[PDB]
Amino acid sequence: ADVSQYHVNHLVTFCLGEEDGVHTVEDASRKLAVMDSQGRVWAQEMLLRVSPSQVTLLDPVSKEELESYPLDAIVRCDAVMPRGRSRSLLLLVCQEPERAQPDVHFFQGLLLGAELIREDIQGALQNYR
Amino acid sequence: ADVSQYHVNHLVTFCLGEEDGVHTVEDASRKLAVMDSQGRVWAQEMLLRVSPSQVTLLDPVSKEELESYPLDAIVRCDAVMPRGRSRSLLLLVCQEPERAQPDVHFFQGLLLGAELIREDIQGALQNYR
Ligand SMILES: [Ca+2]
Ligand SMILES: [Ca+2]
């Protein structure tokens, strides 16, 4: 029942519209690959904080919240390894209240890794449920 | 060169994908109308703050930032009156850095109105430019 924080690299955030073609995890990974080839992916260092009530994204430097997700807004969290890469990516799917559509977020887990963060967030999701 | 704050009602936030069909202001208004008919629009009271460097959305109660937009992330801001309604809506189009696509936001301007807020934000955009 704690607060933890990890340094991750945010790769991309995109919406799941009703007409995009992103239906599976593999489609989400594919889109990241295409955006990368379009020069639309720039690894941004970020602090990812997991607490009993929310997951927060913060600026490592400023230290100010950039985004905050109550746990009930989180749809799923997975450690995913897309074909082509070798280090798992952290996949987070969320639905902010204020938003019409849910979003997909990909982060590189770095040294501690995507699986550990996924487990921490999943544990937080269960205890909240 | 000041900080101002308005009480508004947030109606909807949706992304401008590359495949949705929302290309004009009228298409954006139309989509709000369709989402409303789908029971997907619930007026949420919010504080909208305009400062020399950002536009911020906050909880009237908690008073905590829900969203923050540096002025350079703001694409446009208009007072729009969709056919069917009689009070102008505040339209804000933004592109967060971390996001793959820009977003459309509609708010009701309430007593002070959408035009005054639009002017305030537009004035802030110019001075920043
Ligand atoms: Ca924990
Ligand atoms: Ca002003």
For residue B26, what are its two tokens?
């009228």
Say if CB A93 and CB A76 are below 8 A apart. Answer: yes
Give the 3-state secondary structure of chain A: CCCEEEEEEEEEEEECCCCCCCCCHHHHHHHHHHHHHCCCCCCEEEEEEECCCEEEEECCCCCCEEEEEEHHHEEEEEEECCCCCCCCEEEEEECCCCECCCEEEEEECCCCCHHHHHHHHHHHHHHHC
Best mutation target among A8, A13, A15 (most B Cβ atoms within 10 Å) is A15
Report how far residue B121's alpha carbon sits from residue B118's, in angstroms, rounded to the nearest whole number. Answer: 5
Look up tokens 């954006």; give the residue. B28
Q: What is the DSSP letter of B99?
A: B
Pairing of strands A103-108, A4-15: antiparallel
Q: B51 touching A, CB under 8 A?
A: no
Say if CB A6 and CB A117 are below 8 A apart. Answer: yes
Residues with CB under 5 A from ligand 1 (ion): A 2, 4, 120
Q: What is the H or E stretch that residue B78 is in?
A: strand B74-80
**Number of domains, chain A:** 1
What are the DSSP calls for B36-71, one per residue? HHTT----EEEEEEE-SSEEEEE-TTT--EEEEEEG
User: B13 and A97 in contact by Cβ < 8 A?
Assistant: no
The Cα angle at residue B73 between residues B67 and B75, in degrees rounded to 5: 115
Instruction: Supply the range of the domain harboring residue A95.
Output: 1-129
Best mutation target among B36, B98, B105, B107 (most A Cβ atoms within 10 Å) is B98
The Cα angle at residue B84 between residues B79 and B87, in degrees rounded to 5: 40
Pairing of strands B54-58, B65-70: antiparallel
Q: Which among B17, B40, B97 has the least Cβ separation from residue A17?
A: B17
Distances (CA, A) of B106 to A104, B9, B11, B57, B94: 23, 9, 6, 13, 12
Backbone angles phi, psi at B22, to 5 degrees: -95, 100
Q: B20 touching A, CB under 8 A?
A: yes
- Resolution in angstrom units: 1.9
Ligand nearest to the CA of B51: 2
Grouping H, G, I as helix, E, B as strand and the rest as coil, residue B115 is: helix
The CATH number of whichever domain residue A36 belongs to comes to 2.30.29.30
For residue B65, what are its two tokens?
């930032």
For residue A75, what are its two tokens?
């749809």
Among all residues of chain A, which has the CA nearest to that of B100?
Answer: A14
Q: What is the H or E stretch that residue B84 is in?
A: none
A60 C-beta neighbours (distance < 10 Å), count: 12
* Technique behind the model: X-ray
For residue B3, what are its two tokens?
């900080």
CA-wise closest residue to B67 among B79, B82, B49, B83: B49
Distances (CA, A) of B57 to B8, B76, B92: 10, 16, 12
